[PDB]
Amino acid sequence: LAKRIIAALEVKDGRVVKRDSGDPVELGKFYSEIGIDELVFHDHTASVEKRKTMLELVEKVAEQIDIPFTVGGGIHDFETASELILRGADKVSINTAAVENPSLITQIAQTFGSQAVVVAIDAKRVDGEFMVFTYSGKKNTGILLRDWVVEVEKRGAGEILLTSIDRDGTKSGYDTEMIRFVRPLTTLPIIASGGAGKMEHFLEAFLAGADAALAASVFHFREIDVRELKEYLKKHGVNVRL
C-alpha cells in the first residue's frame, strides 16, 4: 500500500563508487537515519575477491542498519544467493543469470520465499519495442519486456526492479511510459529506476503505478532531501511512511 523511497549504492572493493563519504556502511546508516525506506547495493568487485567482498559488505550492513536491503551484481547461482541471504541480506537482485536460467528465480524462491527474490530488468526501446538487456546493458537479448515480465512472475519472483536504459544516468525523469507499459502485466511490486532529477519525478513515477522509486546521486549529492521529498509526496496524495 505505502509507496517506498529506495537509495541505490554502487560499490567496488568495499568503496561507494563516487566521517567517510565513500564508506558504504556509513552512507547506508546515514540513509536509514534521514528516512530512506530500503537500500540496494550493486557490487562490481573483481571475480577473485568478489564473493568475500560481498559477504563482508552484507555482514557489516546487517548489524549497523535496521531497514531492509537488497544485494546484487553478478549473482550467478543459488549457492551465491543463499550465502548472501544467510549472512544478513533481506533480498538478492538477479538479472543476467535470471534471463539465462529462469529456473534460478524459482530455486531461490523455494528456499527463501518469493519476497527474497528481486529480478532487476534493464530495458530499452529498439525499433519501437521494449527489449530486455543483460550484462550491464551490453547485450540486447531479443526478449520482449512484455514476455519477460510475465515469465518472471510465473517463475516466482517477489519484485521487479525496472531500470530504463533510455533514462538511467540522466536527470530528465523516470520512464513513466515504460512503467505504465509494465504495470498491467504483473501483480508484483515495481521499483522504478533511472532518470530521477527532482521531487516531481517521484510523483510522476507513482502516478505511473510504481510501488517504489530508486535513486542514487540525487540523494548522494543532496540535490534532493529525503524528508522534503516525503513531505512533498504526502502533500500531493501519495501514501509514504512518515
User: What DSSP character marks residue 145?
Assistant: H
**Rounded to an integer, what distance in angstroms lies between the CA atom of residue 113 and that of residue 117?**
7
Please identify, using beta-carbon distances, which residue of 53 and 136 lies nearer to Ni ion.
136
Please give the single-letter amino acid code of residue 4: R
153: helix, coil or strand? Answer: helix
Q: What is each CA distance from 192 to 20, 147, 195, in whole angstroms?
A: 29, 19, 9
* Residue 173 C-beta: closest distance to Ni ion, Å: 22
Nearer to Ni ion, 74 or 173 (CB): 74
Q: How many chain residues touch Ni ion (CB under 5 A)?
A: 1
Q: How far is the CB of 34 from Ni ion (least distance, A)?
A: 26
Cα(49)–Cα(45) distance, integer angstroms:
7
DSSP symbols for 171-194 = SS---HHHHHHHGGG-SS-EEEES
- For the bound state, the minimum distance from the C-beta of residue 135 to Ni ion, rounded and expressed in Å, comes to 8
136 binds Ni ion (CB under 5 A): yes
Shortest Å distance, C-beta 150 to Ni ion: 24
Q: How far is the CB of 124 from Ni ion (least distance, A)?
A: 15
Is 236 strand, coil or helix? coil
Q: Which stretch binds Ni ion (CB under 5 A): 15-23, 33-41, 82-90, 134-142?
A: 134-142
Closest contact distance (angstroms) between CB of 193 and Ni ion is 12
Q: Which residues of 224-242 are buried (b: 16+ CB within 10 A; e: fewer)?
A: bebeebbebbeeeebebee
Cβ atoms of 81 and 94 closer than 8 Å: yes
Binders of Ni ion in range 66-105 (CB under 5 A)? none
Strand residue runs (E) in the chain: 4-12, 15-16, 38-43, 69-72, 91-94, 117-126, 129-134, 139-144, 159-164, 190-193, 212-215
115/136 with CB nearer Ni ion: 136
Q: Is the CB of 107 or the CB of 193 nearer to Ni ion?
A: 193
Binding span for Ni ion by CB under 5 A among 131-139, 168-176, 202-210, 234-242: 131-139
Among residues 101 and 136, whose Cβ is nearest to Ni ion? Answer: 136
- Residue 168 binds Ni ion (CB under 5 A): no
Closest to Ni ion by CB, 106 vs 136, is: 136
| Residue nearest Ni ion, CB atom distance | 136
Which parts of this chain interact with Ni ion (CB under 5 A)?
136
